[PDB]
Amino acid sequence: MKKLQIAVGIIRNENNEIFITRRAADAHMANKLEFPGGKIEMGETPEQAVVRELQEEVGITPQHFSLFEKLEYEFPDRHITLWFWLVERWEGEPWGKEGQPGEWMSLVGLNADDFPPANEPVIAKLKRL
């Protein structure tokens, strides 16, 4: 099947809230909550991809971020490797730059069932921080 490398950014403010967007109804993992991110392209690194994806999707440039978790997940029709970057400093103010819903969500209130199932261990690990 299809095999993808995906970089996403966990955007955390100083109030323990995360900037979360919601995927379109016609997308893979439709209507799910998500960390902004996307496919790592040929000729770019995982670090470059999370910067580019956050610039495109929510209008911020991550800086001094760290790899929170890397994991693989087998969906029904595709295999992806997810790079979860913890982003605690950035230039700009995140918004729905691609017209998608986005809002700040308390970390304690996140419900893993609202996200793709691949995110389950990451959401749990974030809550222990």
Ligand X SMILES: Nc1nc2c([nH]c(=O)n2[C@H]2C[C@H](O)[C@@H](COP(=O)(O)OP(=O)(O)OP(=O)(O)O)O2)c(=O)[nH]1
Task: Could you list the residues known to form a binding site for Mg(2+), using ranges.
Answer: 37, 57
What part of residues 47-106 is at the interface with ligand X (CB under 6 A)?
73, 80, 82
**According to CB under 5 A, which one of 22, 24, 38, 114 is a site residue for Mn ion?**
38
Q: Are 65 and 86 in contact (CB under 8 A)?
A: yes
Neighbouring residues of 60: CB distance < 8 A, sequence distance ≥ 6: 11, 54, 90, 91, 92, 93, 94
Provide the minimum distance between the beta carbon of 88 and ligand X in the complex, in angstroms, as a whole number. 17
Q: Of the listed pieces 60-68, 85-93, 99-107, 114-122, which binds ligand X according to CB under 6 A?
A: 114-122
Give me the residues paired with residue 75 across strands: none
Asked whether position 121 contacts Mn ion by CB under 5 A, the answer is no
